[PDB]
Design a protein around this ligand. Structure first.
Ligand SMILES: C#CCOC(=O)NCc1ccc(-c2ccncc2)c2cc(NC(=O)NCC)ncc12
Length: 206
């Protein structure tokens, strides 16, 4: 079944994480987790739908990324039987890569390597929520509210089963790369907030 296949893939990632996200011991992989989520928001911004992306480092050492784009699609596509968002979040060598030389692997890898991940989508007048634990959804994507805003928010807590040594996000690593990303995708506003020490930055080119 999908269930079994979905779990086999999450297990493949968990078993050889470095190969998918990058080195799990020097902070390469850990920060890549953030840039992988941001990359999909960047794509939405390059297509003209998202104007601002906000990256927040929380005091519990989770990170959220939010955008003001269209929201990830919510409907159940016939042939998978779960929301399109859930397929994106669950269906699948970076080992020795360094920094910007890493290849894009998709947000399902971030999900597999997160102790917890929350997805919130504002789309078609409605707020939708799904929670995952090491990639396994708690429940099907669900409507929790009504809204006239649109956007996508991912918050994730990196698994301490995967990441060792460098386990806390370094503001400056995120600042440096997010600044480069805003330069490399002109027009897009990126904000970085650190709730640990109140640091904030706003990167934009025009
Ligand atoms: C139906 C229809 C028209 O097309 C859309 O509405 N597209 C919105 C959309 C699609 C796919 C993705 C996506 C996400 C993750 N991996 C791969 C792709 C989208 C991602 C995002 N933003 C996003 O992932 N932000 C992180 C906080 N926004 C709209 C998306």
């Amino acid at each position: 079944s999908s269930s079994i296949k979905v779990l086999k893939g999450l297990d493949a990632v968990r078993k050889r994480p470095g190969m998918y996200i990058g080195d799990t011991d020097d902070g390469t992989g850990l920060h890549h987790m953030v840039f992988e989520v941001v990359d999909n928001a960047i794509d939405e911004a390059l297509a003209g739908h998202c104007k601002e992306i906000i990256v927040t480092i929380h005091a519990d050492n989770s990170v959220s990324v939010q955008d003001d784009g269209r929201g990830i699609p919510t409907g159940i596509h016939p042939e998978e039987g779960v929301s399109a968002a859930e397929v994106i979040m669950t269906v699948l060598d970076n080992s020795y890569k360094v920094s910007g030389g890493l290849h894009g692997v998709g947000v399902s890898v971030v999900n597999a390597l997160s102790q917890k991940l929350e997805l919130v989508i504002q789309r078609e007048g409605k707020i939708h929520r799904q929670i995952y634990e090491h990639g396994v959804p708690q429940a099907p994507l669900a409507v929790t509210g009504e809204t006239e805003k649109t956007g996508t928010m991912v918050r994730f807590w990196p698994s301490l089963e995967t990441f060792t040594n460098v386990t806390e996000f370094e503001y400056e690593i995120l600042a440096k790369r997010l600044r480069e990303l805003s330069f490399l995708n002109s027009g897009v506003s990126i904000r970085l907030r650190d709730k640990r020490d109140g640091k904030e930055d706003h990167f934009h080119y025009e």
